Each structure stands twice: as C-alpha cells, then as structure tokens.
Subunit: 210 residues, 6 copies
Amino acid sequence: PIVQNLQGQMVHQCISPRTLNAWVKVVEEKAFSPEVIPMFSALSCGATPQDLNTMLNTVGGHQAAMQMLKETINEEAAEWDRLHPVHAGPIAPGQMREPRGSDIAGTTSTLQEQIGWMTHNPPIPVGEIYKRWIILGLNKIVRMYSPTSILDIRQGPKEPFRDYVDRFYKTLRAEQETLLVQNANPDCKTILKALGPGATLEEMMTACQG
Amino acid sequence: PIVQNLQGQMVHQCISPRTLNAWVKVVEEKAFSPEVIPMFSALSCGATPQDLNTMLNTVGGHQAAMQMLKETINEEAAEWDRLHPVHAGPIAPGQMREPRGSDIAGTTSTLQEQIGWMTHNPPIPVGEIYKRWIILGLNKIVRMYSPTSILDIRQGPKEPFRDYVDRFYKTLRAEQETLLVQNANPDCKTILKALGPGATLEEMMTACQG
Amino acid sequence: PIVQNLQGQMVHQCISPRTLNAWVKVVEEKAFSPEVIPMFSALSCGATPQDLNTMLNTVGGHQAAMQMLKETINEEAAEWDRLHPVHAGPIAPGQMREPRGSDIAGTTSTLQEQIGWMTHNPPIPVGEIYKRWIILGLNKIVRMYSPTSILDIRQGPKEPFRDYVDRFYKTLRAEQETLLVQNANPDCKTILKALGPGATLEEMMTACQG
Amino acid sequence: PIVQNLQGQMVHQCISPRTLNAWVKVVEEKAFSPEVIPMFSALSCGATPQDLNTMLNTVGGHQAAMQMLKETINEEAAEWDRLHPVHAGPIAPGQMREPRGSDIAGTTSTLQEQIGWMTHNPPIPVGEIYKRWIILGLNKIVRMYSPTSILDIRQGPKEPFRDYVDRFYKTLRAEQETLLVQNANPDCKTILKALGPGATLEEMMTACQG
Amino acid sequence: PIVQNLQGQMVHQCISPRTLNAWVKVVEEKAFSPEVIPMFSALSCGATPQDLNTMLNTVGGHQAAMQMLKETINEEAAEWDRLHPVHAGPIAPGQMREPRGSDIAGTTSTLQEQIGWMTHNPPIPVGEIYKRWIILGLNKIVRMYSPTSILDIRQGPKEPFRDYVDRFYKTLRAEQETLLVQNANPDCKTILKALGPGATLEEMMTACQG
Amino acid sequence: PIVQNLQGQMVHQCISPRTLNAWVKVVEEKAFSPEVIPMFSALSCGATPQDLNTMLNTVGGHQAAMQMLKETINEEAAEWDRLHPVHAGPIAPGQMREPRGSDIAGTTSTLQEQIGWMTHNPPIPVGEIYKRWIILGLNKIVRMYSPTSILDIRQGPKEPFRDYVDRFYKTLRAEQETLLVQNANPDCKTILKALGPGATLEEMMTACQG
Ligand SMILES: Cn1nc(NS(C)(=O)=O)c2c(Cl)ccc(-n3c([C@H](Cc4cc(F)cc(F)c4)NC(=O)Cn4nc(C(F)(F)F)c5c4CCC=C5)nc4ncccc4c3=O)c21
Ligand SMILES: Cn1nc(NS(C)(=O)=O)c2c(Cl)ccc(-n3c([C@H](Cc4cc(F)cc(F)c4)NC(=O)Cn4nc(C(F)(F)F)c5c4CCC=C5)nc4ncccc4c3=O)c21
Ligand SMILES: Cn1nc(NS(C)(=O)=O)c2c(Cl)ccc(-n3c([C@H](Cc4cc(F)cc(F)c4)NC(=O)Cn4nc(C(F)(F)F)c5c4CCC=C5)nc4ncccc4c3=O)c21
Ligand SMILES: Cn1nc(NS(C)(=O)=O)c2c(Cl)ccc(-n3c([C@H](Cc4cc(F)cc(F)c4)NC(=O)Cn4nc(C(F)(F)F)c5c4CCC=C5)nc4ncccc4c3=O)c21
Ligand SMILES: Cn1nc(NS(C)(=O)=O)c2c(Cl)ccc(-n3c([C@H](Cc4cc(F)cc(F)c4)NC(=O)Cn4nc(C(F)(F)F)c5c4CCC=C5)nc4ncccc4c3=O)c21
Ligand SMILES: Cn1nc(NS(C)(=O)=O)c2c(Cl)ccc(-n3c([C@H](Cc4cc(F)cc(F)c4)NC(=O)Cn4nc(C(F)(F)F)c5c4CCC=C5)nc4ncccc4c3=O)c21
Ligand SMILES: [Cl-]
Ligand SMILES: [Cl-]
Ligand SMILES: [Cl-]
Ligand SMILES: [Cl-]
Ligand SMILES: [Cl-]
Ligand SMILES: [Cl-]
Ligand SMILES: [Cl-]
Ligand SMILES: [Cl-]
Ligand SMILES: [Cl-]
Ligand SMILES: [Cl-]
Ligand SMILES: [Cl-]
Ligand SMILES: [Cl-]
Ligand SMILES: [Cl-]
Ligand SMILES: [Cl-]
Ligand SMILES: [Cl-]
Ligand SMILES: [Cl-]
Ligand SMILES: [Cl-]
Ligand SMILES: [Cl-]
Ligand SMILES: [Cl-]
Ligand SMILES: [Cl-]
Ligand SMILES: [Cl-]
Ligand SMILES: [Cl-]
Ligand SMILES: [Cl-]
Ligand SMILES: [Cl-]
Ligand SMILES: [Cl-]
Ligand SMILES: [Cl-]
Ligand SMILES: [Cl-]
Ligand SMILES: [Cl-]
Ligand SMILES: [Cl-]
Ligand SMILES: [Cl-]
Ligand SMILES: [Cl-]
Ligand SMILES: [Cl-]
Ligand SMILES: [Cl-]
Ligand SMILES: [Cl-]
Ligand SMILES: [Cl-]
Ligand SMILES: [Cl-]
Ligand SMILES: [Cl-]
Ligand SMILES: [Cl-]
Ligand SMILES: [Cl-]
Ligand SMILES: [Cl-]
Ligand SMILES: [Cl-]
Ligand SMILES: [Cl-]
C-alpha cells in the first residue's frame, strides 16, 4: 500500500504477509458473509490497484463469484472511460497520464504509474476508485449468495425474542421495522402491539423477554 | 487510527490486521461480557470514526445488539445536533466545517475530514466522541444481556466464600455491600455480623475461609 | 528485499522470518494451485535475486517442478544474453557492470551488485526481471499439473449451477463462455438458451438458481 | 504507554493488542500465582494510569480479587491525599495541577493530564505510583490465595530432595532456611546435620541426591 | 545482526525472538534436509559471529552433527590463520586488529570487535566469512545424512513419472540427466528413447504422463 | 533493554511481550537443558538488570534451581564489592555513583540508575555483568541436573554409531575423544582402532556406518 512514513511524503510499501494471510483466511472461514466486505476494506487500507488484484488473486476457489467480480469491474471500468475520455498528447514533465478504466483496475498500469497517481498533488486515488468498484461487485455477490429471504424469518412459538431478532437483522444485512413485529410469535406480537408504533428495539426486546 | 509518528505531528495509519482479528475474536469468545467493553476501548485507541465503524461492521452475528447500537448512536447523534447546530457559510482556508452527529458517526464524513478534525489545532476528537457514544450503547447491551440479578446471588451451604464473592461481583459488574453479607450462608453471616459494619472485603473473606 | 526507509533512499533489508515461513507453508498446503503464483509475487515484493533464490530453495520436495523451474530460468537467461551482450571495458566509478542472465538469476552476482543494480539511477530491476522469469516458469508448472480439462467439466443432473460454475472457472484458471452454457445440464441449458447470447454470469447464475 | 520515540521526547502510544492479549491469557492460565505479578509489571512497562485500568478491566472473573484490588487502591489513594494536599490556585501556563489519589488511579484524570504528568520536567510518574499501588494489592491477593503453609511442606520418605525443595520455595514464594532442613525426611536430615549449619543450597541438594 | 537503520550507518540490533524460534523449529521438524541450509542462511542475514554461535547453540540434540560442525569450523579457521597471519603492533586509533580464525568464529572476539569489523570502511565481513564456514560444514552433514543413493532411485512399474522425478532430484539435491532416463520403467524409457537426447524435463515429463 | 534507536544514542525500551513469552515457554518445555542457556543470553540481549530479574521472576516453578541462582548471584555480588569498594563522596553533575554488587543485580538500583550506567561514556555494562553472573549460576544448575555421566554412555550392540555419538556429546554438553572410541561396541571399536588416533568425527562416523 501507500503509507505516509516518518516524513510527510506518501510512499509505497510491500503488502505484509499478515495482510495476505488475513484476507485468505477470512474468505476460507466466512466465504461471502456480509462482514467479509468491511474486513476487505480494512485489510486493503491504502492499497494500490496492484495490491487489490493481489488480494483477489490469492483467493482459491469461489471462482464463480470472482468471475462475477470480473464482469462488474469491467462494467465500472467501461463507465469510467465513458465519463473520462483520455485526451491525447505528450505528458508534461512531472505529470501523469490520465488513467483509463483498465488502468484503475491495474490491468494496463504499472506499479510506478499507480504510485504516481496516488501520490500526485492533487492525487488520483485509483486505489480507492478500484476498491469502490470491487466492494460494489462484492455486495452483489453477498446478495446473490444470501440464502434466506426476510419474509421467511419468523419467530418460533418457543423461540426467544432475542434469538429471533438476531436471525432477522442477520438476514436483513445479507439482503441489504414493522415486518419485525409482524413476524413475531402470537404471544410477543400481542405485547408489541400494546407497546405503540414508535417503540425502539431495546424497548421491544425488553417487552418480550422470557 | 491517528498516531503521532517520529515527528510531533498526528498522522493517520491503517488499522492493523492484529487489531481487526483481536476485536473479532473477543466478540466470538466472550460475546457481551463486561470485560469486552474495555477491550473495545483499548483496541480502538486513537481510532477514527471510520475505524470504529470498521470494528463494529466486522462483527458477524449478534445483529440484535448491533441494531440496538445503531439506535443509540442515532439518539446521541441527534442530541449532538440539538446542542451544536452547524452555522452556514463558506469554510475559511485551513479550517474545517462543523461536524454533525452523522459526521461524528462516520456516515456523512470522509476519512480526510475525520483526519482534519482529529488533527486540528485545537482538535475536534470526533473519534473519542463517537467512541463515547458506542461505549454507552455497548453498556446498555451488557445490562440487557445480563442473565442473573444481584438478588439471586446467594452463597450455598457448602459453597466457599471466595467462590461466592466471585459470583457476586461478577453479576454486580454486569448489572452495573451489605447485600453481600445478607446473601451469605448462615455460618458465614454469623461470622460477618460479629466482625463489624466497617469491615473490608479481605477482612470478610479472611473471616469466612474454610 | 529493497525497501525505501524513512529517507527517500532505497536500501536493502533482510528477508523476514514471517516471509520465509509464509512461502514455505503455502507450498506445503496448496502445492501448485493457481493462487500460489500471486502469493509468490506478493511475498517477493521488492525481493533481490538472492531473496528469490532463497524462497525457491526453502521449498522441500516438488523437486521435479523446481528442476523444470531451473530449465525455464536458464532459457530466459540465455535469451537475455542474446538480446543484451555485455560490452567489455573498465567500469567507471559510481557505475555498475551490465548484468548477464546468470547475474539476474543471482548465480554469478553478489548481493552488493544486486543492490547496486536495483538502487541505481536509473535502476536495473534485476529482481523484477528474475521474478518475471520465475513466474513464467511457475505458470508452466501450474498448467502441467492441472489435472482436469475444461472439456470434462460438465454440470451434473442434480448439481447446483453455482457449484458447477465454481468447478468450471477453477479448472479454467489452472488451464489458463459458450462452453459454460454447453456443459450445463439439460434443464439449465434450456433456461440459458432462452436468455440470449449476451447474458452476464450473474444473469446466467440467477436464471438457473434452484 | 509513554515511550521515547526516535527523538528524545517521551510520547504516548496506544497499548498493543499483543500486550492486551498477553495479560488476559496469563490471568486465565495462572490466575494469581506469584509469577503473575512480575509478568504484570513487565507488560505494563511505561503504562499510563489509563493503560493500567485497561489491563485490570480486561480481566473477566476473579472479581473477588479485583474488588479487593479496588479497596487497596482506595487506601493508597487516600494516603496520597493525606501526604500531598492539593493547594488551590490557577495553574500557570505550561504547568500541571497537583494529582490527587483518584487522579493517579485514572479516575478523575484524563489521558492528556496523565501525559502531561508523566512527560513533565521533572516528571510526575503517576503510572509508576499507580502501578506500585496495584502491585501492592496484587501481592495481598497472592498471599490470601496461597493454599499451603510453609509448615506443611515436608519431604516424603521416598520423595527426591530436589522435588521437595521445589515445593518448599514455591510455597515460600507465595507466602512471601533451617526449616528446610527440619522438614526433610529422616535419611536426608541425618546427612544435612553432619554437613554443617553454613551449607549452601547446592551443597545441601548435592548431599541428599539419590 | 547488523542492519542499516534510518540513517545510512550500519548498527547492531538484537536477534529477534522470531528468528531464534524459527531456527530452532526448522531443525526440530526437518533436521538436516537440504532446504534447511538456505533457511539457515536467510535467518542469519547480516548476523554477527555471536549471532551465528547463538543459532548453533540453541539447537538441542543432533550433537553428533554439531560436533562435526565444530571440527569443520576449526579446519577453516586454521586455514584462515595460515593465509592471514596477524602482524604484531599497536592498533592505530579508529582502526581494528586483524581477525584470527577463532576471532571470526566468535571464540576470541567480543561483540564490540565484531561490530567494528563488520561496520568498518572497508568492512571485514567476519559474519559472512563465518557463515561461509558454517554452511560448508552443514553441507557435509547433509551429504553424510543422505540416506539413499541416486543409483537406487528407479521408477516403479506403476509409479507415475512425476512422482519418480520428485524422488530423483530430491535424492540428487541431498547427495549434491541420462541416469534419470536409465532409471525409468521400461514403458517410459521406450518413450524417452524415441524423444531424443536433447529433451527438456517438461518434455520428458509430458511424454510419460499417464 | 537498551537499544540504539534511529539516532546514535542508546535508549531504554520496554521488554516485548514476545520476549517475555519466549523465555517462559522455553523453560516450561526444556527446563534446564544445555541449549536453554544460550537461548536466555539471546532473549536478554541488551537487557538491563531490571529486565534480567523480570525474566527470572516470570519463571514459575523450578524454585529449587532459582534459589540456587540467588545464592550464586549473592556470591558474585559479594566478590564484586570485595574488588570494587565504593568511595564515598558527592557525585559530580552528569556522573553516576559506583555500582555495588546489589546494584548490578538490580536490588538497590533504580531503572534510571541502570540506564545511566549502561548509557554512560564510558559505559558500565551492569546488564552484561549481571547476565554473566546469571549464566554462571545457570551453568551450575545444568551440571547439577545432568542425569547421566559420560562414563555410562556406551554404544549398544545394535545401536547405530550416529545415534550413539548423538547421546555421547549430548551428555558431554550437559556435564560440561578417546572415551568416545572406548565406549563403542566391539564391532565399531575394531574399525576405529584400525583407523588411526588422529581421525576426525566425520571419518569415525563414516567408518562405522551400517
Ligand atoms: C487479468 N485481468 N483481466 C481482466 N478483465 S478481462 C480482459 O475481461 O478478463 C481484469 C480485470 Cl476486469 C481486473 C483485474 C485484472 N487483473 C488480475 C485479476 C484480478 C482479479 C479480479 C477479479 F475481479 C477477481 C479475481 F479473483 C481476481 N486476476 C484474474 O483475473 C485471474 N483469473 N484468471 C482467470 C481465467 F484463467 F479464467 F482467465 C480467472 C481469474 C479470476 C476470476 C475467474 C477466472 N490480476 C493481475 N495480476 C497481475 C497484473 C495484472 C492483473 C490484472 O490486471 C484483470
Ligand atoms: C450506514 N449507517 N446507517 C446508520 N444509521 S441509520 C440511517 O439509521 O440506519 C449508521 C449509524 Cl447510526 C452509525 C454508523 C453507520 N455506518 C456503518 C455502520 C456501522 C455500525 C454501527 C453500529 F451501531 C453497529 C454495527 F454493527 C455497525 N454499519 C451498519 O450499519 C451495517 N448494517 N447494515 C444493516 C442492515 F443491512 F440491516 F441495514 C445492519 C447493520 C448492522 C446493525 C444491524 C443491521 N458502516 C459504514 N461503512 C462505511 C462507511 C460509512 C459507514 C457508516 O456510516 C450507519
Ligand atoms: C545454483 N544454480 N544453478 C543454476 N542453473 S544450472 C548451472 O543449470 O544448474 C541456477 C539457476 Cl538457472 C538459477 C538460480 C540458481 N541458484 C540457486 C537455485 C535456486 C533455485 C532455482 C530454481 F529454479 C528452483 C529452485 F528450487 C531453486 N538453487 C538450486 O538450484 C538448488 N538445487 N540444487 C539441485 C541439485 F542438487 F540437484 F543440483 C537442485 C536444486 C533445486 C532444483 C532441483 C535440483 N541457489 C543459490 N543459492 C545461493 C547462491 C546462488 C544460488 C543460485 O544461483 C542456480
Ligand atoms: C471506576 N473506579 N472506581 C474506583 N473506586 S470506587 C469509587 O470506590 O469504586 C476506582 C479505583 Cl479505586 C481505581 C480505578 C478505577 N477505574 C476503573 C477500574 C479499574 C480496576 C481497578 C481495580 F482495582 C480492579 C479492576 F478489575 C479494575 N474499573 C472497575 O472498577 C470496573 N468494575 N466495576 C465494578 C462494579 F460494577 F461492581 F462496580 C467492579 C469492577 C472491578 C472490581 C469488582 C467490581 N476503570 C476505568 N475505566 C475508564 C475510566 C476510568 C476508570 C477508573 O477510574 C475506579
Ligand atoms: C566454544 N567453542 N569452542 C570451539 N572449538 S574447540 C576449542 O575446538 O572446541 C568453537 C568453535 Cl570451533 C566455534 C564456535 C565456538 N563458540 C560456541 C559454540 C558454537 C557452536 C559451533 C558449532 F560448530 C556447533 C554448535 F552446536 C555450536 N558452542 C559450543 O561449542 C557448545 N558445545 N559445547 C560442547 C561440549 F560441551 F561438548 F564441549 C558441545 C557443543 C556443541 C557441539 C558438540 C558438543 N559458543 C559460544 N558462546 C558464547 C561465546 C563464544 C562461543 C564460541 O566461541 C567454539
Ligand atoms: C529480591 N532479591 N533478593 C535477593 N537476594 S537475598 C536479599 O539474599 O534474598 C536478590 C538477588 Cl541476589 C538478585 C535479584 C533480586 N531481585 C529479584 C529476584 C530475581 C531473581 C533472582 C534469581 F536468582 C532467581 C529468580 F527466580 C529471581 N526475585 C526473587 O528473588 C523472587 N523470589 N522470592 C522468593 C522468596 F519468596 F522465597 F523469598 C524466591 C524468589 C525466587 C527464588 C526462590 C524463592 N526481583 C526484583 N524485582 C523487582 C525489583 C528488584 C528485584 C530484585 O532485586 C533479589
Ligand atoms: Cl508481517
Ligand atoms: Cl477460499
Ligand atoms: Cl482456484
Ligand atoms: Cl479523480
Ligand atoms: Cl428459514
Ligand atoms: Cl429473550
Ligand atoms: Cl434463519
Ligand atoms: Cl499486524
Ligand atoms: Cl460473533
Ligand atoms: Cl452478519
Ligand atoms: Cl469539540
Ligand atoms: Cl443463580
Ligand atoms: Cl474460601
Ligand atoms: Cl451465578
Ligand atoms: Cl518477522
Ligand atoms: Cl513442500
Ligand atoms: Cl528437498
Ligand atoms: Cl533494464
Ligand atoms: Cl471431472
Ligand atoms: Cl445454485
Ligand atoms: Cl472437478
Ligand atoms: Cl500488536
Ligand atoms: Cl480470567
Ligand atoms: Cl466479569
Ligand atoms: Cl512525585
Ligand atoms: Cl501439603
Ligand atoms: Cl534428588
Ligand atoms: Cl505441595
Ligand atoms: Cl519478535
Ligand atoms: Cl533439534
Ligand atoms: Cl543438547
Ligand atoms: Cl576481508
Ligand atoms: Cl530406495
Ligand atoms: Cl505422471
Ligand atoms: Cl526414495
Ligand atoms: Cl511484541
Ligand atoms: Cl516452568
Ligand atoms: Cl512459583
Ligand atoms: Cl566496568
Ligand atoms: Cl544410560
Ligand atoms: Cl550410523
Ligand atoms: Cl542416554
């Protein structure tokens, strides 16, 4: 990634073995759960487009999702070229050429060019633009691999209300208020209807404790 | 987080994979025990609002508690806007705009803005203000998930006094003096009543050793 | 490797025990899966030819592949000498001699010479030239050890379409569009034929969900 | 803690996840064995009063001992106020207010104030003063939880003298010379009595080897 | 070891616990396999003669090999004194005395003297000279503990050619072309004889795939 | 320990949790094997007398040996006072008082005084003087706990000569040439007697391979 060192300058440093291993392990253990996306954004802090492709390439398996990640990046890269056409001409000394979509994705750009774009003044955050494309495609993967719909998360007759709300918002996070009340069991729904329409979650959970 | 480097300046650095993993593991192993709150405050030392949302997002499951954490942050953010209304006008060069409640929560604020607020002179510790909101909501979660009341922690007839005091103050910490004497078994309560009302814990524990 | 320190200068530092262990473990666990190649490129970030030979030497076993890696490096080193003949003459003060193929492979070159080449102005990235030779030979090993052909990856009658696409592009990555449709089961192929020839993968996967 | 950086100045840095985990694990595995006290003093090297409360708060369970640690800190803090009464008056620029007992314990003091006290010239080591209070209370816990008295550590008829001396000074360390000779078995005590009253331990152990 | 810090100067730093543990573990797990030698050279990067003796001393067991390592170092140290006799005389200020064989082995030399030799201008790499002696003796140990001769590595009638070449060059690496063809089974040797005398390994392996 | 930072000055830094854990684990797993002594010397690189007492205090159990370590340190400290009597008088500004035996052992000396002694010009290496006392006492512990004598290490009738030499020099290292030949079995001793009195170990091991 690009990290500010002891001085104020932004400089490139190699991706650490801990970062490489942490990203590989979180995909092996949690696949494409919703919490894998913010873990990816944190492990790729300040990452160059080369570092982003490194993390995505180290993932063995799940190639159906990774191929869908290819098509999404290609769609976003094509829209970038539609909105930012590169103007031909010799690049002035001390300046950088305009990045294309494939340049932001690290396909037609070198590490030196990515360092120049990200450390420019003003900078061209090609790493954050690429990560924004990857996270978008990763969110489409999480929604596609979401197994349960929010309409099928109903509280059991003996299920504690806390455990049911855990399953409700867990499914809601993968799929990306009153339905929570409607899907409760008859005993708790009677309690929640007498509580008022403007109750908080900690008020609803406290009312249906057992 | 924002860490003072070799020079005196405060600069941003990426959250480490060790910090990300340490927070995820402590929630998997201890859930919402009282000691998870100070562990969260230590792992989020100098954290920006972005780093705080990162730690809260990496938590898979327990979404009922995390959704209650949303409503608490929204309540504290709304009170911040009620006490600190943003005055319109162009921001002077070298200055930062006034943060709103959602800006402190990292919702409508960029990392660059959070760096400017936290490294300002004088600084606006939006990270510590946000963490103070999160810890408050986390304390409400610990009290809600506290299983046992302090009134039901009584010493057994054969239970050693040390083990009973362990259960007493463990429950007392989750729920957030004379009751300790009252809930002791008849043999130790006779000893403690003859010891005096101003005895220390190490004096009470020494008196009921067996 | 060669890492820019606190100052702007590029300086040599020893390869870390974490990097040594991470490369040995990834070969023990995944052998020559496609994702081992980008893991090798990331762990050898900024590596000198000496560090590259170190990583390749620490691999115990798989010597059939490592010997094929020798012949590939020898072929690329011989082509380098054919395109870059060293011109005889005394080396001027502050300058470096022209590297041969065996010099880039770290065979006839010292660490001091590799530091001088990589930190020259302009630099001679003998480490990146050598790594480009190693990755090329490693790609030939992955293709040789690829067990299944893409023609034999067909969807089962009861196999979910997601799992089949996982096996399809996993094999496709090792071997290095319409065939994916042709190798599907009759039920999904009927669905995909009525979808159109320009469908995306997430559209094809959504159409054959079961 | 407060660590001298590259320059000569003392600056604050966040407590590391390794330090947090090392202290939690050593209490889970060894509870209040005598060697836990020096482990606590080493892990809290240069720690601020905030870092000390962090380590003590991350301990789950053993709340009977931790509550006794509260009363000891309160006793030492009350004695500090009895010996160092704070004199009222406006604090001069560049100076710090006089710390109270609760200020040294991190109860009524901010991290900024603790940084100012510990980095003052001359410094006020509120962290070392607080740690001296904690270690004192921790030593009272070790002595209270010491199970065996030194009077009951006697050498068995077939017990090797080395193993018996191991149990002797292990108990002696928890409880905090001739008794070692008296508590030996008749065979070794006959040997030690003929050795002289001024024998060393390695001389006594060598004399009773079997 | 001696590592260049933030400035250009070479300075001594303590050997890390990770380096100490990594060397002890690799000897416990792989003993004296050929890949242990380059692992030793990498873990001892920039090591002083004191650090080299530290790594060799931390090895418990295998003392027969370590004693053979003593005699080899003594032989190389005696040859160094035969080629570099120390000339008597007072050492000038800012200069270092000429190292003997036992000085390079860290036997009659202090750490301060080793720092002065390795950081001299021009430097006397006593650490690299000592490591060159140790690696030479370690190579004699690997050849002595090599169990199988290359003449006894023959391909089985049903053994895949890939697995046989793995055993061939594994044995060849421990012992330190046409024989590979001769030791193949009759079916593959017929294929290799019709392939030509100038075939590569990947051509020979491809020809005998089954 | 005292480590040279980015500048040339020697400064104190806290002992790392990895160093604390590495020393505790090596005593739990290997007790007082000979290789524990050089592991202690490496982990205590640049350690102050306070850090040395920290490592020795974190050892739980083995108190018989640790108490023998007390008496040895007391003997060496008493000899230091006999050879270096402290001359009374006011200490000049910028100077340090003469250390006593208990000052070198960290008993009557503060960390600030130990920093002043070790960073003086010229320095007083009280840490290396103390470590030299500890290693001496640790060597007496290894010899006392050495179970087998070198006279009882004889080669079995069917024992391979390599395994027997492993047991020979392993015992020889704990206890601290021709005997190796005498203690061999009759078959190998006949071979070694016909080899000559000036044979090396690798020659003797090669001659008795089976
Ligand atoms: C090659 N490249 N081409 C693209 N677009 S394109 C013409 O339409 O195909 C494409 C795009 Cl859009 C984005 C980036 C890459 N990029 C990759 C990518 C990363 C990546 C992106 C993902 F979104 C998901 C990933 F997991 C990895 N790695 C690969 O794709 C490796 N891979 N190979 C094959 C196969 F063998 F089947 F072809 C398959 C894969 C993974 C996906 C399924 C099959 N690595 C690199 N390393 C070194 C140097 C440059 C690059 C690089 O620039 C791009
Ligand atoms: C999105 N946002 N919106 C809010 N308030 S609001 C209109 O009323 O809803 C809200 C508030 Cl108050 C605080 C912060 C966030 N914030 C989050 C939050 C963090 C967070 C806060 C918690 F207090 C508890 C957490 F675990 C995580 N992450 C999410 O909330 C992710 N999430 N999504 C859904 C669902 F899919 F169900 F919608 C659910 C969750 C977790 C809780 C239960 C369901 N991440 C971010 N990352 C990247 C960039 C910005 C942001 C961000 O600004 C805020
Ligand atoms: C010695 N050298 N010679 C070559 N070309 S050449 C005349 O034709 O043979 C050759 C080439 Cl092309 C590339 C680099 C090396 N290089 C190696 C190589 C690395 C390497 C390259 C690979 F591509 C695969 C690897 F795993 C390791 N290590 C070895 O080869 C060790 N090894 N030994 C034997 C055997 F004993 F069988 F001979 C075998 C091996 C491994 C492969 C199978 C057998 N390490 C070194 N360390 C210290 C100092 C210099 C060097 C070094 O310069 C070169
Ligand atoms: C709150 N505070 N108050 C005190 N003195 S006082 C009026 O008489 O009670 C007291 C004293 Cl003397 C010392 C320090 C604290 N301090 C603690 C303490 C640390 C601590 C000290 C110990 F010596 C042992 C510990 F483990 C932890 N943490 C707590 O005490 C948490 N806790 N809560 C309860 C309960 F819920 F039961 F109340 C219990 C505990 C732990 C002990 C048993 C019950 N953390 C903090 N974090 C953030 C900011 C400030 C602070 C803080 O200033 C002080
Ligand atoms: C003592 N010294 N003497 C030598 N040459 S000499 C007169 O002929 O014997 C000799 C040589 Cl040539 C090389 C270096 C050492 N050196 C060792 C050596 C390292 C070493 C070298 C190896 F090549 C293999 C190793 F594993 C370790 N450590 C030891 O040897 C410890 N050891 N002790 C005994 C025994 F007890 F049996 F005597 C045995 C061993 C290990 C080998 C088998 C028995 N450590 C040290 N630490 C602190 C300070 C200085 C030194 C040191 O200078 C030298
Ligand atoms: C206290 N002190 N006194 C000594 N000499 S003296 C009057 O004759 O007794 C003595 C000497 Cl010579 C050397 C150093 C210490 N030193 C220790 C020592 C370290 C140490 C040295 C060893 F060589 C072996 C060790 F493991 C630890 N720690 C202890 O001894 C703790 N301990 N306590 C008891 C008991 F409870 F039984 F008393 C026992 C032990 C361990 C040994 C067996 C019993 N830590 C400290 N921490 C904080 C601050 C100062 C100090 C300290 O200065 C010295
Ligand atoms: Cl790392
Ligand atoms: Cl995976
Ligand atoms: Cl794959
Ligand atoms: Cl831009
Ligand atoms: Cl369901
Ligand atoms: Cl419930
Ligand atoms: Cl569910
Ligand atoms: Cl990390
Ligand atoms: Cl969890
Ligand atoms: Cl979730
Ligand atoms: Cl403010
Ligand atoms: Cl109960
Ligand atoms: Cl009790
Ligand atoms: Cl309970
Ligand atoms: Cl490391
Ligand atoms: Cl392997
Ligand atoms: Cl091998
Ligand atoms: Cl070039
Ligand atoms: Cl198949
Ligand atoms: Cl499916
Ligand atoms: Cl398959
Ligand atoms: Cl850490
Ligand atoms: Cl615990
Ligand atoms: Cl608790
Ligand atoms: Cl003071
Ligand atoms: Cl007992
Ligand atoms: Cl004994
Ligand atoms: Cl006992
Ligand atoms: Cl380390
Ligand atoms: Cl071993
Ligand atoms: Cl040994
Ligand atoms: Cl030389
Ligand atoms: Cl064989
Ligand atoms: Cl094969
Ligand atoms: Cl074999
Ligand atoms: Cl550490
Ligand atoms: Cl132990
Ligand atoms: Cl103990
Ligand atoms: Cl001295
Ligand atoms: Cl024996
Ligand atoms: Cl043998
Ligand atoms: Cl034995």
